[PDB]
Design a protein around this ligand. Structure first.
Ligand SMILES: CNC(=O)c1c(-c2ccc(F)cc2)oc2cc(N(Cc3cc(F)c4c(c3)COB4O)S(C)(=O)=O)c(C3CC3)cc12
Length: 544
């Protein structure tokens, strides 16, 4: 079965699209090499269409069925509830795409009679009809990168009314089932500090640890009808209301397995027979499907004492080494098994014998030291894309503020602290916008967050140590320094000078502002203060 069929109609935009980095009076203070930063547009959609369109073959063996039976046995212990229309509505983001039938996201959130009436009719239709394919819109995503250019990724999503109905049927399922089925292997359950702790203790639990990342090429396209039906059979193991069972069956048959693709102008672009990236079950589905295939592939490879970590289509296995040559042999068998299950790799997997050399979800573990001199592990990444996006966001207001998301999730890193915090707090000070809530996206969920609350948020996610880390590793410092030279960002010495000023300015304002000065910028001062404590990817999900 081909992942997609195409009619020839183009994937069209719904608004003007910029590819070139916008420049304002603040741009050069962050980044000088402007031509290295670009945004993707619908003009490259055709190139992506070629990449994501291919034939899938699946061969399923006993290892696959054995693991599935185990997953279903765990799923059988889960009890999930239907959300009411009101509850589902409150989970709808304020800036979620409006319905084709005369209401928007704010009408949903307000429980307006028109929006509520349509939702009730869509739900009734799901209960009454389990066959008619549901329409979807296909769009090119506009995302920002540094050169070496990527073609635009594609998003596929149904109408707002359907999206609310997905929440009613499945929000409690996708929120509760994966952790029960996959246990400690389900990566979404951890804060950044908990995840790094899990990874470290997992590495030390093995006598001779070996680990590897495995990244599938265009995972969404490798997901077959079988895969999506097997996912449904897992959901249906739950203790559910009969009305929920029918809605889940209907959504699977009419939406999740496949459907027609329509562009922004209303033309049929073709047909999908693989994972839709903009449905509620995308994250949960990919995570279950990746975990199933990978667990079965570990058994085929005879890998000893495996601990897996899975987040969507991102996979890491840490296991007991059988020797360097034996380990390398077993990874080939793994890849062969994964390939028979439809999930061949982008690059072949590599065994690693140092935890810090495994990269996954674009991240790796590194080490720094706290105020006492004790080693502290933390998750970091190559800062090139965060910084390119920060540059765009310096001159353009965007729907999601990646800089804010990055400060929160990478708070302990030397690049988030020295550059992102310093740059954006300076901007916020100048416009007196410290108290203004901003949208950012964490694990695919949209959150509205006031910058003034960052200290409390960072402590809870990473611990108090995130405000006093020092003596970073030579490898991490060198990667950061090299990235700055590459993009024409000023060197770290300049950012320390700027941070002193930004800190002084925050202290001057007092209150929560001064708390941001004290905690976020203690690294900048020569004589430190002793810091005490402070008193659904594509799923269309929102939280306060
Ligand atoms: C690969 N599997 C894992 O679970 C992860 C490893 C990893 C595992 C094993 C290794 F050996 C090395 C790294 O490192 C990780 C780092 C993160 N973070 C970064 C991050 C990545 C993202 F894609 C997103 C977000 C954050 C927010 O919203 B996004 O969807 S972090 C520092 O916030 O914790 C995550 C996040 C998304 C859950 C997972 C892993």
């Amino acid at each position: 079965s081909m992942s997609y069929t195409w009619t020839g109609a183009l994937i069209t935009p719904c608004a003007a699209e910029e590819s070139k980095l916008p420049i304002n009076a603040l741009s050069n203070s962050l980044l000088r090499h402007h031509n290295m930063v670009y945004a993707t547009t619908s003009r490259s959609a055709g190139q992506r269409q070629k990449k994501v369109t291919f034939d899938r073959l699946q061969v399923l063996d006993d290892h696959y069925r054995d693991v599935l039976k185990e997953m279903k046995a765990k799923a059988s212990t889960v009890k999930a509830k239907l959300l009411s229309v009101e509850e589902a509505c409150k989970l709808t983001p304020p800036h979620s795409a409006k319905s084709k039938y005369g209401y928007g996201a704010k009408d949903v959130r307000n429980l307006s009679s028109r929006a509520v009436n349509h939702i009730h009719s869509v739900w009734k239709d799901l209960l009454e009809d389990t066959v008619t394919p549901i329409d979807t819109t296909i769009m090119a995503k506009n995302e920002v990168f540094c050169v070496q250019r990527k073609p635009a990724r594609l998003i596929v999503f149904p109408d707002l009314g359907v999206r609310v109905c997905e929440k009613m049927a499945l929000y409690d399922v996708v929120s509760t089932l994966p952790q029960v089925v996959m246990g400690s292997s389900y990566g979404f359950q951890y804060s950044p500090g908990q995840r790094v702790e899990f990874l470290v203790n997992t590495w030390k639990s093995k006598k001779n640890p070996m680990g590897f990342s495995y990244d599938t090429r265009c995972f969404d396209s490798t997901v077959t009808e079988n895969d999506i039906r097997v996912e449904e059979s897992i959901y249906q193991c739950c203790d559910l209301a009969p009305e929920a069972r029918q809605a889940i069956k209907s959504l699977t048959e009419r939406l999740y397995i496949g459907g027609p693709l329509t562009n922004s102008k209303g033309q049929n672009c073709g047909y999908r027979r693989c994972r839709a990236s903009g449905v509620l079950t995308t994250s949960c589905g990919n995570t279950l499907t990746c975990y199933l295939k990978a667990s079965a592939a570990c058994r085929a490879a005879k890998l000893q004492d495996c601990t897996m970590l899975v987040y969507g289509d991102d996979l890491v296995v840490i296991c007991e080494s059988a020797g360097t040559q034996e380990d390398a042999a077993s990874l080939r068998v793994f890849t062969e098994a994964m390939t028979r299950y439809s999930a061949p790799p982008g690059d072949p997997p590599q065994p690693e014998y140092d935890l810090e050399l495994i990269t996954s979800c674009s991240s790796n573990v590194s080490v720094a030291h706290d105020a006492s001199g004790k080693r502290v592990y933390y998750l970091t990444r190559d800062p090139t894309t965060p910084l390119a996006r920060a540059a765009w966001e310096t001159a353009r207001h965007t729907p999601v503020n990646s800089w804010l998301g990055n400060i929160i999730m990478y708070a302990p890193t030397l690049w988030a602290r020295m550059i992102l915090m310093t740059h954006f707090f300076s901007i916020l000070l100048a416009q007196e916008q410290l108290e203004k809530a901003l949208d950012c996206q964490i694990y695919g969920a949209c959150y509205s967050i006031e910058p003034l609350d960052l200290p409390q948020i960072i402590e809870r996610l990473h611990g108090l140590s995130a405000f006093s880390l020092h003596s970073y590793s030579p490898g991490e410092i060198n990667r950061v320094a090299s990235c700055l030279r590459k993009l024409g960002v000023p060197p770290l010495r300049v950012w320390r000078h700027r941070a002193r000023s930004v800190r002084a300015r925050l202290l001057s304002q007092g209150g929560r502002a001064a708390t941001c000065g004290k905690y976020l910028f203690n690294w900048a001062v020569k004589t430190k203060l002793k810091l005490t404590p402070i008193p659904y990817s594509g799923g269309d999900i929102y939280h306060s």
